Amino acid sequence: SKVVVPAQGKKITLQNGKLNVPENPIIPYIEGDGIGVDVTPAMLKVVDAAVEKAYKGERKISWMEIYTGEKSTQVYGQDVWLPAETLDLIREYRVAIKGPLTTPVGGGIRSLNVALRQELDLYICLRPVRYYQGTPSPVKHPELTDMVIFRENSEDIYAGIEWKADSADAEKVIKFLREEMGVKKIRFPEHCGIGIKPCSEEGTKRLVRAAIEYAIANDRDSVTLVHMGNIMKFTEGAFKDWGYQLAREEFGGELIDGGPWLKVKNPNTGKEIVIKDVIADAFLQQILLRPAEYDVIACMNLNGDYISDALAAQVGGIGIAPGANIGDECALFEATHGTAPKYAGQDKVNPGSIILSAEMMLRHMGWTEAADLIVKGMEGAINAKTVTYDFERLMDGAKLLKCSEFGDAIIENM
Amino acid sequence: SKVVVPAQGKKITLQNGKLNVPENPIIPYIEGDGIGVDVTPAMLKVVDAAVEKAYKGERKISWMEIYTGEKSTQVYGQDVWLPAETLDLIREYRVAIKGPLTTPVGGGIRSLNVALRQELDLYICLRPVRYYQGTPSPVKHPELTDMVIFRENSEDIYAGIEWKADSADAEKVIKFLREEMGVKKIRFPEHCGIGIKPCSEEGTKRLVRAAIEYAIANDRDSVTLVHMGNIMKFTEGAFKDWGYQLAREEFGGELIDGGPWLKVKNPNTGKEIVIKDVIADAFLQQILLRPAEYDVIACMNLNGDYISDALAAQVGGIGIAPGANIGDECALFEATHGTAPKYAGQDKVNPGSIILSAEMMLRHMGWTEAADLIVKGMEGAINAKTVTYDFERLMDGAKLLKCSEFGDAIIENM
Ligand SMILES: O=C(O)C[C@H](C(=O)O)C(=O)C(=O)O
Ligand SMILES: O=C(O)C[C@H](C(=O)O)C(=O)C(=O)O
Numbered sequence: 001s002k003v004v005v006p007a008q009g010k011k012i013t014l015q016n017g018k019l020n021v022p023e024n025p026i027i028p029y030i031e032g033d034g035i036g037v038d039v040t041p042a043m044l045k046v047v048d049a050a051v052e053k054a055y056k057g058e059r060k061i062s063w064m065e066i067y068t069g070e071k072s073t074q075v076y077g078q079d080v081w082l083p084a085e086t087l088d089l090i091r092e093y094r095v096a097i098k099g100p101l102t103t104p105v106g107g108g109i110r111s112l113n114v115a116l117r118q119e120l121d122l123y124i125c126l127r128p129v130r131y132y133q134g135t136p137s138p139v140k141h142p143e144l145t146d147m148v149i150f151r152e153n154s155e156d157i158y159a160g161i162e163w164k165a166d167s168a169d170a171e172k173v174i175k176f177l178r179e180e181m182g183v184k185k186i187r188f189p190e191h192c193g194i195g196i197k198p199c200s201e202e203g204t205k206r207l208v209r210a211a212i213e214y215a216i217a218n219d220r221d222s223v224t225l226v227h228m229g230n231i232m233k234f235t236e237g238a239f240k241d242w243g244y245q246l247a248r249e250e251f252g253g254e255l256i257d258g259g260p261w262l263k264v265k266n267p268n269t270g271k272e273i274v275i276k277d278v279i280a281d282a283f284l285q286q287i288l289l290r291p292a293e294y295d296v297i298a299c300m301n302l303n304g305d306y307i308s309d310a311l312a313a314q315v316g317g318i319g320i321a322p323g324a325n326i327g328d329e330c331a332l333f334e335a336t337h338g339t340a341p342k343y344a345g346q347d348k349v350n351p352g353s354i355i356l357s358a359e360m361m362l363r364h365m366g367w368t369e370a371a372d373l374i375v376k377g378m379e380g381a382i383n384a385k386t387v388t389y390d391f392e393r394l395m396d397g398a399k400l401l402k403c404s405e406f407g408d409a410i411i412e413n414m
Numbered sequence: 415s416k417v418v419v420p421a422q423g424k425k426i427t428l429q430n431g432k433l434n435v436p437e438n439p440i441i442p443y444i445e446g447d448g449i450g451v452d453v454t455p456a457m458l459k460v461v462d463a464a465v466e467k468a469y470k471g472e473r474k475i476s477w478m479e480i481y482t483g484e485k486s487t488q489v490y491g492q493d494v495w496l497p498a499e500t501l502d503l504i505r506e507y508r509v510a511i512k513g514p515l516t517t518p519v520g521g522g523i524r525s526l527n528v529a530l531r532q533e534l535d536l537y538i539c540l541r542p543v544r545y546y547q548g549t550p551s552p553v554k555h556p557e558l559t560d561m562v563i564f565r566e567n568s569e570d571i572y573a574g575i576e577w578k579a580d581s582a583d584a585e586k587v588i589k590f591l592r593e594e595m596g597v598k599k600i601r602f603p604e605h606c607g608i609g610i611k612p613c614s615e616e617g618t619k620r621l622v623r624a625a626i627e628y629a630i631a632n633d634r635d636s637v638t639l640v641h642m643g644n645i646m647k648f649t650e651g652a653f654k655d656w657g658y659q660l661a662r663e664e665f666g667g668e669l670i671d672g673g674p675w676l677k678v679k680n681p682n683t684g685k686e687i688v689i690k691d692v693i694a695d696a697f698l699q700q701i702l703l704r705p706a707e708y709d710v711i712a713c714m715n716l717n718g719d720y721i722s723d724a725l726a727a728q729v730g731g732i733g734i735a736p737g738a739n740i741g742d743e744c745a746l747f748e749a750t751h752g753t754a755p756k757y758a759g760q761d762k763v764n765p766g767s768i769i770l771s772a773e774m775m776l777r778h779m780g781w782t783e784a785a786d787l788i789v790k791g792m793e794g795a796i797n798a799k800t801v802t803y804d805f806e807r808l809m810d811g812a813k814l815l816k817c818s819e820f821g822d823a824i825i826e827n828m
């Protein structure tokens with residue numbers, strides 16, 4: 001039992017659908033493997049600057065380190081990549097932030113980030129994606145992208161119910177299917193790997209309610225449901241209709257002229273949030289070709305994964321992209337990139353993802369003013385062309401700063 | 415039994431791994447629903463011009479119309495969307511070309527294009543994607559994209575083994591899984607839709623052999639295997655390793671320095687084709703950010719679907735993209751877009767996909783010179799800015815030609 005609690009500090013508390021943030025919250029952070037080691041400090045510093053600038057010394061976060069990944073095997077045991085105690089702690093502390101986690105191949109360990117999302121049941125995975133002025137982009141008009149992806153987390157093929165080809169479990173899921181279910185469309189059973197894709201009504205509805213409710217809450221223009229429903233009828237296809245049914249019975253959506261698009265009024269502003277839908281392979285196109293038609297996006301696990309990383313590259317934000325996993329009893333904000341071992345310890349990586357995820361946490365905790373300062377340090381440093389090797393290698397006349405030095409430059413721009 | 419055979423003409427013939435094209439082949443073509451009606455003529459004309467220019471009246475294609483879609487219900491019966499006779503005929507005639515097919519909702523009919531791919535077993539779906547100079551693009555450097563996608567067709571989630579939520583078949587595939595297989599990771603069984611994803615060894619190997627063999631045959635630089643293997647271990651993950659194993663035992667690939675990338679020598683040119691792999695969500699990024707690292711791409715059905723349409727938009731070729739479905743006993747080349755009923759009969763659509771698919775057919779039939787003329791009519795007309803509303807609305811000082819008028823402009827540019 002090896003975490004050392006900050007002695008000064010209090011736990012974030014939940015008062016029935018509200019958080020109760022102390023002035024001094026203890027916030028767990030997993031340092032992160034690989035380059036986790038450079039960005040997590042650049043984040044600790046520029047957020048500790050952020051609450052000291054905004055609440056003028058009245059608020060203070062009590063950082064408490066936890067482990068997962070590779071840092072649990074060098075602390076607990078050579079075989080522990082996710083302690084049970086880590087699960088307890090995100091749950092009790094309510095909020096945690098984390099850098100990148102490596103998952104060993106060769107040992108039975110599923111992707112550790114998905115392991116955390118499922119075991120804690122962080123059903124919403126909220127990944128903003130917008131253009132910061134001056135960010136090097138592949139695209140001609142990156143400023144039309146300002147979208148919000150609510151990839152569902154607990155479900156879809158992405159859960160990992162899969163059995164190895166020519167094992168027994170693989171062998172008799174197929175024997176069951178060929179005989180008992182009468183399945184004819186498996187071309188080759190012999191030496192065939194089988195995966196299972198779930199998509200329930202509850203897991204769909206709960207994700208889409210948080211998608212509509214965020215578009216109400218921030219006076220956004222639309223919630224697009226993305227799905228490859230025209231082939232995946234009773235999973236993706238179902239997510240679309242459930243999505244719609246909840247829009248209609250819970251938020252009272254009106255049919256728009258012939259449909260299936262609905263008009264939900266935004267009760268506060270009286271505006272109309274549109275509820276369209278777009279089939280998953282065309283959506284990947286409409287985001288480079290009509291990016292300004294999209295605003296909030298709701299989708300199942302796999303498509304949110306791809307849609308996110310596609311949209312993140314369009315805005316040159318491969319490593320500036322923030323992201324969270326919000327659940328109902330806790331929320332864990334994360335670096336959306338991997339560990340980089342060739343660059344790790346070299347202090348050259350971009351800490352922008354994790355610092356922008358730290359921004360998403362602070363706004364969630366209610367500390368608006370702190371979060372806002374970090375959003376300006378960020379906009380300032382990047383449009384001041386005083387940047388880090390990934391932007392700089394593509395940015396004319398940029399000054400090259402090390403990861404730390406870029407943390408520094410966000411602070412001075414606050 | 416309602417197809418009217420061209421009386422003059424001969425069937426394409428297969429002489430053991432070779433086609434035997436008459437001077438006058440009968441080639442079936444399905445006209446195509448919706449706008450199929452404008453493009454299929456613009457294609458018939460600019461290909462009939464193409465063999466008359468190149469073989470100087472010595473060759474002639476005997477067009478034979480067949481039906482599927484909506485045109486089978488108005489010819490055979492109100493309920494027939496794919497006649498059996500259509501399947502016989504692509505198989506006997508060896509080659510067919512087709513425009514867009516609408517699939518009715520409300521009647522049990524799966525996506526008709528996937529219905530054709532499975533029932534005829536057109537396992538390879540070969541979708542080129544390159545930049546034509548002067549094509550309006552969202553991206554800054556579309557000229558670095560010249561890629562070839564071999565999306566596997568017969569398998570993956572895309573086959574459609576799925577059971578409706580709260581039906582009995584859905585209900586006891588889940589009872590089977592919870593009890594007999596010991597599955598714990600379905601968060602919500604109640605009212606859950608289940609899909610099944612197959613990925614065999616044979617269906618993977620056969621697709622990857624045609625991917626390597628095309629990169630040998632055209633002196634391409636690399637075959638990238640794309641897969642979301644890091645979560646889909648015994649399907650996608652397996653496609654990757656099979657892919658690799660076939661590269662290694664069949665085409666004798668060498669380990670490159672530590673791997674898993676292999677060096678296969680191209681026997682003809684003695685060059686080295688590289689066999690890399692890239693995880694499916696990062697691949698969607700590396701195509702806008704390093705497009706020149708990719709050359710041939712091999713992947714399972716679903717990812718080839720998305721990868722294709724994403725890459726097609728990057729080169730402004732949403733409707734210029736060609737594509738085939740090659741099988742072992744026949745090959746069916748197709749318009750890669752939908753039917754457009756708002757624009758249909760208005761003769762304003764871009765026929766470029768279907769005409770470029772007609773080009774891919776002619777080269778396949780061995781008529782190189784004809785295919786090549788169509789590739790120049792195409793390059794000429796578009797860099798002569800004498801184009802159709804989709805390019806024109808984004809192209810300064812373009813002349814606006816109707817679909818027909820653009821077929822015309824390709825001919826005059828031959
Ligand atoms: O596990 C990882 O590191 C990759 C992760 C996923 O596969 O779910 C990812 O890319 C994402 O979080 O979207
Ligand atoms: O059936 C269609 O019309 C869409 C088709 C698919 O879903 O397989 C497609 O988009 C493609 O052919 O790639």
Ligand SMILES: [Mg+2]
Pocket residue numbers: 305306309695
């Ligand atoms: Mg991802």
Ligand SMILES: [Mg+2]
Pocket residue numbers: 281719720723
């Ligand atoms: Mg498609």
